[PDB]
Amino acid sequence: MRHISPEELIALHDANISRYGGLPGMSDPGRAEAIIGRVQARVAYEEITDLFEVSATYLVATARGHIFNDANKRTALNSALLFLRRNGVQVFDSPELADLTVGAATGEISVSSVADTLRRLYGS
Amino acid sequence: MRHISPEELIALHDANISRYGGLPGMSDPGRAEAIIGRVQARVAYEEITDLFEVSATYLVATARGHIFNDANKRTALNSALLFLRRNGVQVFDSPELADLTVGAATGEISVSSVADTLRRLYGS
Amino acid sequence: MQSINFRTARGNLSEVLNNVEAGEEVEITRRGREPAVIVSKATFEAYKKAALDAEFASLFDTLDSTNKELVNR
Amino acid sequence: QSINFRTARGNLSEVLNNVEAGEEVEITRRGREPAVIVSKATFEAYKKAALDAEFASLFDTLDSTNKELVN
Amino acid sequence: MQSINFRTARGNLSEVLNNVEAGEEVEITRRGREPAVIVSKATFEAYKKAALDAEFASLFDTLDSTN
Amino acid sequence: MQSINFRTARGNLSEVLNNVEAGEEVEITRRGREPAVIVSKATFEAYKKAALDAEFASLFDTLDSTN
Amino acid sequence: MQSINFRTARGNLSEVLNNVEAGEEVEITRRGREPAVIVSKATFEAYKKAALDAEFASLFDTLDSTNKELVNR
Amino acid sequence: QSINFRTARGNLSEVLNNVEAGEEVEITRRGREPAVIVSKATFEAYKKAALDAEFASLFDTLDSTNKELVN
């Protein structure tokens, strides 16, 4: 599978910050490498192969990780779907994405549950 | 149940250091409160009521915790049996105690397994 | 051992701590409360050092063999 | 748990409660010898474990509930 | 962890770092400011790694498990 | 984490602590010695707590689980 | 784009880094090895900035609605 | 991953391998403009995603595989 590197997350976030607005920068030096590195190590360590479980992991870690001073939710949803697109799964906007992303961010919707929705929305 | 306080562990260790020998002191300031406090919080958090499971927790945490510069094994076995004695269980020396304590310290014998042996040795 | 009220204690504390260091242990009582007491750290530490030394000392007696083996384990 | 006498006399109800929960509360003073406050039970617990140990040191026993004291 | 005021830290710094290298954690206080701590980088890095492992784990505990 | 040599830390200390209070982690290097770090006490305490929680947990993982 | 051996590269590197900054990208080859290449961070960053900007830009197009909603969520 | 040219030419086999594992290795120099080394694939990947984006900027397309270049 293709992954999103910490550096790509920073860039995905910076473009979003400039296109949609928000306060710039990371909340703490090297926090993207810390969280995303751990996301990929979790995937490798738990041997996660389902693309939707992996995507949801990106979504949840970023929604709640507060890597950036702003645009954490937006970067979470975008990184999660960019992940799927990069791995052959076609993605499109949906009325559920906002609530789903807010629920991931608040801790009300778990990774597996985020993954289920995504498996329905974009699964085969 | 009666417990062993961090301060009592220090004292149990100091007496043993002076009666049997070894290098004195703690490996790090406040490490006894850190480990034993966590031992008691583990007991409260997991709601451990079996006296032998609780004793074994003391034994394992101390055998492996390296609270002291020396006499960690001796303090582990003594604190674990002092715990049982303080809670109405009669204790006596045994040929298994050394191996049991060394196995706890190396990580080869788990808490529950340490507890089983103790439940056989001193159980009713 | 003088047994003083909550007020007396709380109102004349430094004076209490003056008597205590002279060696006198003072019990303080509370209404609907289990009592407490107070004397020099020295005379508190002497008793508790005394008690624990004996509680450990006999622990060590009972496990003298293993205690000595574990030194070389 | 160490604290000074001002702190001590200032929040004495809380001190005595902390002590009624197994807390030993040292009472420090500017350039003086410190004091202690603990439960009534706990105190006699140490005392009635300490006396037992020095009565056992003479190797005799009792009754030495006499030196309580009255020469 | 011994605590040292600002002036004592600017006044005895070489030896603060020596003690620190020898494994000590030294708090530095400033009148009217939040205290700092000087500790070996190795120890700090290991503590921060564990703090981040913990933070990361907490991300996967829903509001249900917590608690 | 910016890195600063010894002389620059003895030479600009008030403002090291300011930055540190503002949330920065500052490494202090000494020629021929192990580097130190200055960080806010609050952050340090929280990192150390997590490191100790981790160490404690590791005590209950046998040689079988590790691994 | 000049294609140089492992030796030439490793033996004349500073010179390579001299040509590169002049704008010339240089591929270095290894026997039984996938090739690599090298040019200014500027001309590497320009291409990868170019690619990612477009990969994100269209991502954002596709999720423009939610991206704008989430600002207020 | 940034490193200087001495470090670079000194352990070049390892550098190229790191690069053959998706690593981008910046090559710094005393008072100079830095360089980069990456896989052949990855490089043309960016290039063949970058060109696509500025050919789409004119809004026309191709073939602009001519400015490769030959005015």
Swiss-Prot record, chains A, B:
Q: Which Gene3D superfamilies match?
A: Fic/DOC protein, Fido domain
Answer yes or no on keyword Transcription regulation: yes
Return the PROSITE patterns for the record. Answer: FIDO
**Would I find Transcription regulation among this entry's keywords?**
yes
Which additional comment does the entry carry? Answer: The concentration of antitoxin phd in P1 lysogens is far greater than that of the toxin it antagonizes. Such an excess may assure the well-being of carriers of the addicting plasmid.
Q: Where is the Fido domain?
A: 4-120
NCBIfam families, per this entry? DOC_P1
Tell me how this protein assembles. Answer: Interacts with cognate antitoxin phd, the exact ratio of doc:phd varies from 1:1 to 1:3. Interaction with phd prevents kinase or phosphorylase activity on EF-Tu. Interacts with the 30S ribosomal subunit.
What keywords are annotated for this sequence in UniProt?
A: ATP-binding, DNA-binding, Kinase, Nucleotide-binding, Repressor, Toxin-antitoxin system, Transcription, Transcription regulation, Transferase, Translation regulation
Q: Which Pfam families match?
A: Fic (PF02661)
Name this protein carries in UniProt? Protein kinase doc
UniProtKB/Swiss-Prot annotation, chains D, H:
This one is known as Antitoxin phd
Tell whether Transcription is among the UniProt keywords.
yes
Gene Ontology molecular functions:
DNA binding; DNA-binding transcription repressor activity; protein homodimerization activity; sequence-specific DNA binding; toxin sequestering activity
Q: What is the effect of changing Y46A?
A: Decreases repressor activity, binds DNA less well, inhibits doc normally
Question: Region labeled Sufficient for antitoxin activity, its presence prevents formation of a doc-EF-Tu complex — which residues?
Answer: 49-71
On whether Repressor is a keyword of this UniProt record, the answer is yes
Mutating F43A has which effect? Answer: Significantly decreases repressor activity, binds DNA less well, inhibits doc normally
Q: Which organism is it from?
A: Escherichia phage P1
Reproduce the UniProt comment on modification after translation.
Degraded by the ClpXP protease.
- Keyword tags: Repressor, Toxin-antitoxin system, Transcription, Transcription regulation
Q: Name one GO biological process term.
A: negative regulation of DNA-templated transcription
Main role?
A: Antitoxin component of a type II toxin-antitoxin (TA) system. A labile antitoxin that binds to cognate doc toxin and neutralizes its ability to phosphorylate host EF-Tu. Does not reverse phosphorylation. Bacteriophage P1 lysogenizes bacteria as a low-copy number plasmid; phd and doc proteins function in unison to stabilize plasmid number by inducing a lethal response to P1 plasmid prophage loss. Binds to its own promoter repressing its expression; toxin doc acts as a corepressor or derepressor depending on the ratio, repressing or inducing expression.
What is the gene name? phd
* Complex and partners: Homodimer. Interacts with cognate toxin doc, the exact ratio of doc:phd varies from 1:1 to 1:3. Interaction with doc prevents both kinase activity and dephosphorylation of EF-Tu.
Protein family (similarity comment): Belongs to the phD/YefM antitoxin family.
